[PDB]
């Protein structure tokens, strides 16, 4: 048998995880029941029994233990908002007493909750205001009084910061020992609202108009203010005093962003700011003052990160990782030859020394200790799509060990890692090319303690089913290596011609050609429908240097789009591809590229599918768009904004078969965008196929809708490829 569409839609073959929460330097949790394992022995005693909350009345969505392990916080009444943001009711359970707290509880509809990094201090955000509980039973101190729905955000992010800047809803940051609580405040007063209909249940007679403060390219952005409050000196008589840390002079000159908040030590905080034109960023190191009780950021402590050839950082400037004393830090910056590597900065010095070098990039700094710095890079065998954990010696930078390279070179080439509190032990997470392999290691002698999850249960199931393989190779364009990957059908024959579907994302810093193992839509197409599904990382793709990544700076919808067309052209010359049946599909940014590729009138692609695509950049949000495009004004980059629209390629769709799909409640890429494509195709007399998904957002992640879309796409693809 083969991996069917039903197999994918109904999760027939499930990949087992081993998700763990580190609690101390040698202990971690796991849900079977809630067990607490040991890194030393492996013995696990139950921390909270499966049905300790049998008589609770509510379905517990998530749990949160305080760092001292005295209290557990229970999350229920989950009402998802955007990608990360949501609402939930909260209850605190005493572990040393075994009972819920009934007096002065966390109110219904709480936006965010967080324990202090040590002890059991609690900070929550309700109605856009910040509250603090020193004890779980005592009443909370209201920190901010400015919070206003859709307008003022305290300790929580507005739409744009959540999606594009912080990849999180929370804008609260406890100091390492929970003394201070650092928070941002967003102001959307003048940010225009995106409005769309929400039809809701059949029972709703008149559709709801959802109105979200959302800054489209070049529109009035939110403004950010930072504050730090002293939770140890809070009063229940007078209002909490919140010390402001104003952005540097070089940022207040115009529009800016708060892009990073990292605590250095107990009395030292680092803030990274970014100009609206995102090629200049500055880090303020701010120390706490004694008798004045304020925060000072010495101008000589300012470290600038900029780019002449593009934008600063990959999506944002990388975070700093401070040494224990906080007088030095390590962060990832692009070097002189364009490659991103770890630089060792001195708090007082302007220059930094690169501790890593080469034609490959560092993905992230994982752990910093007294002796070693741990990082993940794609250095192994020069494969940008690989991931390996590396140890580097601080006293000598030439002393670099690979902790995951030679563990299992065959099945493991894509690693992520989870270090314990003081990095004494780490959990390695293998994601491909073989089945996912979760292992636990001791960082002292680097020995392998035990296999946590090998996915043998899945392995035996898949031995029976005809599975597709992955080819991960590179082509040479203009004397430069460009990596592609192919999900090859089972019993792959080189002499037989195959239909090829080109899976596309192609966004700036994208990587679609990697060593990860995945069971997805492509797996079915290769397995059951015998379709080669291929992905290609061209100009604009990440993890290969700024030379390749910035190639599409201020020029979105050009070089990355030509490169998908060129990839498909290169694949035709490979011999095993049917050039009469080549298709292309993408989601989000991929949808835009798909559209653009089909609108190019190249002739390569017979048909395509764009899902929730960007139609033109003035419709997408400011932060992401202007990072690559700049402002849509005559004196900046308006010419290319106008030239890079899919609507202006409408005429060309007469040569191709198009399926446009979009959700009606898409907060991310508004249905507007597809509405303008459809209208454009309609005006030039192009027959195409469409599909809206009522009340579905950008993920189109409803169980029934997910199933529907993929089934609908499968028909389109099969119909296009002459498959019954
Ligand atoms: C957030 O910004 C808004 C708009 O920029 C501020 O609203 C202004 O407030 C001042 C004084 O309070 C008034 O004189 C202006 O007329 C207001 N402008 C508009 C159009 O509303 C608002 O005060 C800021 N919010 C806070 C308090 O942080
Ligand atoms: C702490 O600050 C809040 C907000 O400024 C105060 O509450 C306001 O009180 C003033 C007059 O005392 C009223 O004009 C506002 O309508 C109140 N806003 C609300 C409902 O929060 C509060 O009194 C302050 N606490 C003290 C006494 O220091
Ligand atoms: C496919 N894809 C993205 O499109 C994407 C996008 C993106 C780009 C343009 C339009 C909509 C989105 Br969402 C963004 C920007 N919000 C992002 N941060 N990541 C993306 N990824 C990982 C991603 O995989
Ligand atoms: C493992 O056994 C030791 C016995 O000394 C004990 O300290 C530890 O709590 C046990 N681990 C768990 C949490 O089951
Ligand atoms: C939340 O509201 C419900 C009724 O809508 C109520 O029963 C519950 O006690 C509330 N939660 C608290 C403790 O505020
Ligand atoms: C937390 O750190 C602060 C600031 O350095 C210090 O005043 C205090 O001693 C620490 N608190 C505790 C309880 O360790
Ligand atoms: C930022 O980009 C603009 C054009 O987009 C350019 O004129 C300017 O020089 C850049 N700034 C820096 C610091 O390189």
Curated annotation (Swiss-Prot):
Alphabetized UniProt keyword annotations: Aminopeptidase, Cell adhesion, Cell junction, Cell membrane, Cell projection, Disulfide bond, Glycoprotein, Host-virus interaction, Hydrolase, Membrane, Protease, Receptor, Secreted, Serine protease, Signal-anchor, Transmembrane, Transmembrane helix
Keyword Ribonucleoprotein attached: no
Sites where a glycan is attached: 43, 50, 108, 177, 187, 239, 279, 478, 643
Pfam family, one: DPPIV_N
Expression (tissue specificity): Expressed specifically in lymphatic vessels but not in blood vessels in the skin, small intestine, esophagus, ovary, breast and prostate glands. Not detected in lymphatic vessels in the lung, kidney, uterus, liver and stomach (at protein level). Expressed in the poorly differentiated crypt cells of the small intestine as well as in the mature villous cells. Expressed at very low levels in the colon.
GO molecular function: aminopeptidase activity; chemorepellent activity; dipeptidyl-peptidase activity; identical protein binding; protease binding; protein homodimerization activity; serine-type endopeptidase activity; serine-type peptidase activity
Regulation: Inhibited by GPC3 and diprotin A.
Upregulating conditions: Up-regulated by IL12/interleukin-12 on activated T-cells. IL12-activated cells expressed enhanced levels of DPP4 but not mRNAs. Down-regulated by TNF. Up-regulated in migratory endothelial cells and in the invasive endothelial cells in tumors. Induced by hypoxia.
Disulfide bonds: 286-297, 343-352, 402-405, 412-430, 607-720
Effect of mutating residue 478 to A: Does not inhibit dipeptidyl peptidase activity, interaction with ADA and homodimer formation
Effect of residue 708 to E: Inhibits strongly homodimerization, dipeptidyl peptidase activity, interaction with CARD11 and T-cell costimulation activity
GO biological-process terms attached to the record: behavioral fear response; cell adhesion; endothelial cell migration; glucagon processing; locomotory exploration behavior; membrane fusion; negative regulation of extracellular matrix disassembly; negative regulation of neutrophil chemotaxis
Segments in the Extracellular topological domain: 1-724
Effect of substituting residue 177 to A: Does not inhibit dipeptidyl peptidase activity, interaction with ADA and homodimer formation
SUPFAM superfamilies membership: alpha/beta-Hydrolases (SSF53474), DPP6 N-terminal domain-like (SSF82171)
Function: Cell surface glycoprotein receptor involved in the costimulatory signal essential for T-cell receptor (TCR)-mediated T-cell activation. Acts as a positive regulator of T-cell coactivation, by binding at least ADA, CAV1, IGF2R, and PTPRC. Its binding to CAV1 and CARD11 induces T-cell proliferation and NF-kappa-B activation in a T-cell receptor/CD3-dependent manner. Its interaction with ADA also regulates lymphocyte-epithelial cell adhesion.
Subunit comment: Monomer. Homodimer. Heterodimer with Seprase (FAP). Requires homodimerization for optimal dipeptidyl peptidase activity and T-cell costimulation. Found in a membrane raft complex, at least composed of BCL10, CARD11, DPP4 and IKBKB. Associates with collagen. Interacts with PTPRC; the interaction is enhanced in an interleukin-12-dependent manner in activated lymphocytes. Interacts (via extracellular domain) with ADA; does not inhibit its dipeptidyl peptidase activity. Interacts with CAV1 (via the N-terminus); the interaction is direct. (Microbial infection) Interacts with MERS coronavirus/MERS-CoV spike protein.
Miscellaneous note of the record: Level of plasma concentrations of the soluble form (SDPP) can be managed as a colon carcinoma diagnostic and prognostic marker.
Protein name, per record: Dipeptidyl peptidase 4
Species of origin: Homo sapiens
